[PDB]
Amino acid sequence: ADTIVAVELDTYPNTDIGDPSYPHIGIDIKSVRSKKTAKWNMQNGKVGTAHIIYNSVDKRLSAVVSYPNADSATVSYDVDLDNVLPEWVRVGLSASTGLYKETNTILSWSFTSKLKTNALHFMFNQFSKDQKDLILQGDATTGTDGNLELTRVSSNGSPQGSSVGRALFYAPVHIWESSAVVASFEATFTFLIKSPDSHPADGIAFFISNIDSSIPSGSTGRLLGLFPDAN
Amino acid sequence: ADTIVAVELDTYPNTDIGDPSYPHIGIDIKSVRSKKTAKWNMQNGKVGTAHIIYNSVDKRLSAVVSYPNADSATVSYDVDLDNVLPEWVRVGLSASTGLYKETNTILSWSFTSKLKTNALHFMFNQFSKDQKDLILQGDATTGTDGNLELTRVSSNGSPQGSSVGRALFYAPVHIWESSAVVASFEATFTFLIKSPDSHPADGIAFFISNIDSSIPSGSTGRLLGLFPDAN
Amino acid sequence: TIVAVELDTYPNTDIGDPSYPHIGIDIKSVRSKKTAKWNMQNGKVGTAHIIYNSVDKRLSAVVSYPNADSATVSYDVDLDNVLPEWVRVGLSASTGLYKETNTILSWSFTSKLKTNALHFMFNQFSKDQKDLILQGDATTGTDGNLELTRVSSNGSPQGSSVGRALFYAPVHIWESSAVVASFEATFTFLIKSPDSHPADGIAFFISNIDSSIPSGSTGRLLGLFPDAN
Amino acid sequence: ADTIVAVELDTYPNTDIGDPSYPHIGIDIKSVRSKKTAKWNMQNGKVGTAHIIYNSVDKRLSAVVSYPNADSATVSYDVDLDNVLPEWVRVGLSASTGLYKETNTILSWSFTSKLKSETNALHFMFNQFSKDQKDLILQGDATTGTDGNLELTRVSSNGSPQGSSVGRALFYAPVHIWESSAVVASFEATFTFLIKSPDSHPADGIAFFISNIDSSIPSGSTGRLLGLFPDAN
Numbered sequence: 001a002d003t004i005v006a007v008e009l010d011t012y013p014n015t016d017i018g019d020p021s022y023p024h025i026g027i028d029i030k031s032v033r034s035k036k037t038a039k040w041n042m043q044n045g046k047v048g049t050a051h052i053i054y055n056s057v058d059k060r061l062s063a064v065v066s067y068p069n070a071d072s073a074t075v076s077y078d079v080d081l082d083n084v085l086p087e088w089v090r091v092g093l094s095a096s097t098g099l100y101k102e103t104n105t106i107l108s109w110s111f112t113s114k115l116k117t118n119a120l121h122f123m124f125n126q127f128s129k130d131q132k133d134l135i136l137q138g139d140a141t142t143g144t145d146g147n148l149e150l151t152r153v154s155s156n157g158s159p160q161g162s163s164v165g166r167a168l169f170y171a172p173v174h175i176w177e178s179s180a181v182v183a184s185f186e187a188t189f190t191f192l193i194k195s196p197d198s199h200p201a202d203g204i205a206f207f208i209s210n211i212d213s214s215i216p217s218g219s220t221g222r223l224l225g226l227f228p229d230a231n
Numbered sequence: 232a233d234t235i236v237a238v239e240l241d242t243y244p245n246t247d248i249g250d251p252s253y254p255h256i257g258i259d260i261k262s263v264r265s266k267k268t269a270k271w272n273m274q275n276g277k278v279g280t281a282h283i284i285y286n287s288v289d290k291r292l293s294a295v296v297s298y299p300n301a302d303s304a305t306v307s308y309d310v311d312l313d314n315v316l317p318e319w320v321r322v323g324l325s326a327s328t329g330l331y332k333e334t335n336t337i338l339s340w341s342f343t344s345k346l347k348t349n350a351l352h353f354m355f356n357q358f359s360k361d362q363k364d365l366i367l368q369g370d371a372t373t374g375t376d377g378n379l380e381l382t383r384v385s386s387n388g389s390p391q392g393s394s395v396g397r398a399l400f401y402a403p404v405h406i407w408e409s410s411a412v413v414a415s416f417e418a419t420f421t422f423l424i425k426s427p428d429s430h431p432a433d434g435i436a437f438f439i440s441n442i443d444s445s446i447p448s449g450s451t452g453r454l455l456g457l458f459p460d461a462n
Numbered sequence: 463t464i465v466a467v468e469l470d471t472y473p474n475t476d477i478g479d480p481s482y483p484h485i486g487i488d489i490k491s492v493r494s495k496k497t498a499k500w501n502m503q504n505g506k507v508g509t510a511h512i513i514y515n516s517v518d519k520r521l522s523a524v525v526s527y528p529n530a531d532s533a534t535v536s537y538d539v540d541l542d543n544v545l546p547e548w549v550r551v552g553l554s555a556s557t558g559l560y561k562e563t564n565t566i567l568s569w570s571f572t573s574k575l576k577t578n579a580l581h582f583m584f585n586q587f588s589k590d591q592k593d594l595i596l597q598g599d600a601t602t603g604t605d606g607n608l609e610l611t612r613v614s615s616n617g618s619p620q621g622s623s624v625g626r627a628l629f630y631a632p633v634h635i636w637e638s639s640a641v642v643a644s645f646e647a648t649f650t651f652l653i654k655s656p657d658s659h660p661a662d663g664i665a666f667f668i669s670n671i672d673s674s675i676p677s678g679s680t681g682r683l684l685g686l687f688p689d690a691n
Numbered sequence: 692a693d694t695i696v697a698v699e700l701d702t703y704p705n706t707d708i709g710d711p712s713y714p715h716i717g718i719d720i721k722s723v724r725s726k727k728t729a730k731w732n733m734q735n736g737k738v739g740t741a742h743i744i745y746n747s748v749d750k751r752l753s754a755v756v757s758y759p760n761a762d763s764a765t766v767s768y769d770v771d772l773d774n775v776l777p778e779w780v781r782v783g784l785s786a787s788t789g790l791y792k793e794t795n796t797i798l799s800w801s802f803t804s805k806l807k808s809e810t811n812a813l814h815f816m817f818n819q820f821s822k823d824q825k826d827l828i829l830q831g832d833a834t835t836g837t838d839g840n841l842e843l844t845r846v847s848s849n850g851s852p853q854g855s856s857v858g859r860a861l862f863y864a865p866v867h868i869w870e871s872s873a874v875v876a877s878f879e880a881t882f883t884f885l886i887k888s889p890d891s892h893p894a895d896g897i898a899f900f901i902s903n904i905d906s907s908i909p910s911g912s913t914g915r916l917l918g919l920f921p922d923a924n
């Protein structure tokens with residue numbers, strides 16, 4: 001029953017539910033089946049950066065994911081978020097593992113949202129063990145090497161399967177308003193995805209939800225902690 | 232029992248509880264009896280600005296209150312907030328009326344905090360009828376002309392006695408941390424205090440509190456919605 | 463070499479303006495690559511907001527007044543192919559046979575590349591504003607405002623004026639190795655006339671770091687263009 | 692002569708001109724002889740961060756310098772900049788070497804200044820310095836681009852630092868640092884740096900400075916004078 005808009009960094013192609021047949025970034029409007037995707041050369045054990053932008057003038061959600069010294073992956077999609085989301089939302093990071101797995105480690109996260117001005121800005125370049133400005137859901141924890149581990153990792157530092165977790169910014173965010181002339185947001189995060197396997201799964205997403213969003217039961221694996229099913 | 236740090240814009244001298252005998256600005260560290268005050272030439276019905284700053288290097292809380300084309304009032308007090316406040320806090324605006332009254336209208340409020348870097352910034356230049364990133368307490372309301380009315384005003388614009396209200400930012404703020412090299416915050420608000428009669432009361436404060444802080448029982452009047460008694 | 467967003471108050475149909483006040487995106491020519499109709503409000507304070515990023519490669523602008531519907535215009539353009547890597551940014555305005563005040567009450571700009579950034583904000587302009595280059599008739603400090611074109615002691619705008627203000631620091635507007643490049647500008651303006659016939663308009667622009675007012679660019683050319691091609 | 696206000700990270704103790712006998716950070720108001728200093732445990736080859744703050748309410752120039760996992764050094768001095776500097780300035784980083792030497796490598800530099808009277812502001816941030824960085828004025832031996840860093844003083848192709856070098860980098864736009872009619876004025880600066888040396892007592896240091904707009908390196912200002920002062924008065 002939640003409403004979700006997300007940008008997904010999908011490490012595991014589930015072609016049975018529409019993923020293209022490679023690792024990819026996508027834009028998800030109310031479904032795990034991305035409205036748009038682009039090919040992504042995920043680099044195991046390397047630190048990448050994701051950058052998500054939107055404004056109400058162009059009505060265009062874009063994302064760029066990059067690693068140092070590599071060509072970046074970019075995806076864009078036309079959508080007026082006033083038609084999808086409620087006026088007030090929470091914003092968050094989600095990740096999952098399944099039969100296959102990976103660390104879903106978040107090293108930094110920033111966000112800015114403006115409504116013309118009213119503004120909200122936060123930045124985490126370090127997460128503490130007791131991060132009262134985050135709502136941690138599922139298996140997500142903070143504080144180990146000052147990072148946000150969205151899914152379960154053991155002490156020896158090895159990722160566990162079938163895990164799901166999220167972190168939402170505590171304050172509601174006014175993401176759109178009819179009376180506003182311009183609304184915009186941007187989000188940045190740095191992430192470290194490492195697998196012992198060879199086959200990493202399942203991904204990390206930046207998402208925007210109704211304020212009371214919770215992890216749907218069963219949303220491990222291909223469902224990214226975002227959706228109750230694959231419709 | 233709440234922990235409070237506040238900067239008060241005190242319109243009504245209660246000489247019997249240690250107010251000086253003129254309107255004043257004050258720094259309150261866990262007591263309504265200001266640790267330092269300065270004379271404040273309040274201007275009934277004009278828009279004022281208050282600016283509050285602190286950093287962990289100087290460990291000095293200062294405040295400056297001004298009106299266009301008038302001399303500003305400044306107060307400062309040396310205090311190590313590390314030994315006063317909890318590590319995580321909420322920030323807020325509070326006001327009250329008693330036997331005597333006034334409007335306690337907030338036209339704008341911004342805050343920035345930094346911990347080295349993690350950061351939180353917000354800015355309100357307009358308040359809406361349903362401002363979900365604020366916790367309104369007591370008599371506080373939003374949406375009347377796009378402003379925050381901290382105390383009761385009638386439909387005819389006139390302020391009411393025996394009122395108390397507060398507005399806190401929804402997200403906790405990490406105000407200090409021992410591992411941190413430098414911590415700083417600042418806050419700015421613009422306010423409009425009108426009274427029909429001579430003699431307005433009781434005042435406006437910017438405050439910092441334990442996360443779960445609430446209006447103390449009985450704290451209309453002299454206690455500014457901050458303190459349970461006049462100790 | 464000019465990219466600009468014009469707030470065109472005077473229809474010059476002679477050279478391809480539409481028959482109504484318009485906003486437009488100008489890429490190297492006063493003949494806008496895209497326009498939109500604009501219900502300019504004579505003597506009210508307006509706001510212009512301009513945005514571009516290198517992911518979308520879309521230059522967009524919105525102009526509005528309180529309690530009025532806004533005007534918006536966009537144009538796809540890759541600034542990598544139109545501007546040098548380093549530029550200056552500014553505001554320009556003109557009058558000719560008709561006239562208007564071209565008063566700037568505020569101006570802010572942010573640019574970002576990858577992370578390198580520049581931000582500035584003027585809400586008040588001073589008599590001797592050393593981080594601006596004033597060109598032509600532009601002056602600062604009267605009531606704390608920037609007057610891009612001539613105004614008399616009592617406030618009457620003068621015909622045949624041109625003036626501009628550029629931020630003193632060069633701006634790094636694109637770099638081929640950047641992941642994301644972006645800018646935004648916002649200004650608030652007061653364009654007033656003693657009749658209808660107000661002219662000629664205000665523009666936010668991006669040029670070469672040595673750009674000066676081209677010769678004979680009063681009027682229709684908004685202080686931006688050497689000819690009407 | 693130029694008017695200079697500076698926060699110095701002084702690696703070399705020139706006790707004959709008033710340095711304490713240890714590496715130190717200090718506040719310099721028109722003289723290389725600091726108004727105030729604190730001991731600084733400089734760490735050869737580690738990346739350090741410096742943070743400089745000032746506001747016109749408290750009128751106290753403070754600085755904190757630090758390294759990961761070490762205690763930071765801090766220094767503060769009460770001084771009203773309105774009395775010392777002209778109203779418009781440029782801001783800069785300077786460094787020098789002498790008989791002894793060190794890399795004076797700047798990896799990042801950010802600055803913000805604000806004035807009220809509803810505010811004017813200027814912010815810049817460099818996390819990368821490019822070969823041809825037109826919003827910087829480079830003076831003396833200073834160069835940009837090598838590994839995207841700003842090298843204030845001369846380093847050989849094999850990365851070894853040279854003695855007797857001086858260089859500076861100033862932001863191109865003038866800064867409105869104070870104004871008569873301002874309710875509050877403030878600035879902060881942050882930079883990260885790498886000082887590596889072969890020698891046992893590295894020299895001479897790095898400084899964040901604020902100067903007249905037309906400031907240039909004074910004659911004879913290598914070594915202990917940090918590219919900032921014509922002499923040791």
Ligand SMILES: OC[C@H]1O[C@H](O)[C@@H](O)[C@@H](O)[C@@H]1O
Binds near residue numbers: 012201221222
């Ligand atoms: O983990 C990879 C893959 O494994 C299984 O098939 C499920 O858990 C999917 O939901 C997931 O995509």
Ligand SMILES: [Ca+2]
Binds near residue numbers: 012013014019202
């Ligand atoms: Ca998948």
Ligand SMILES: [Ca+2]
Binds near residue numbers: 241242243245433453
């Ligand atoms: Ca009182």
Ligand SMILES: [Ca+2]
Binds near residue numbers: 471472473474662682
């Ligand atoms: Ca025209």
Ligand SMILES: [Ca+2]
Binds near residue numbers: 701702703710895915
């Ligand atoms: Ca020395």
Ligand SMILES: [Mn+2]
Binds near residue numbers: 008026032
């Ligand atoms: Mn997918």
Ligand SMILES: [Mn+2]
Binds near residue numbers: 251
């Ligand atoms: Mn009092």
Ligand SMILES: [Mn+2]
Binds near residue numbers: 701715717
């Ligand atoms: Mn010294």
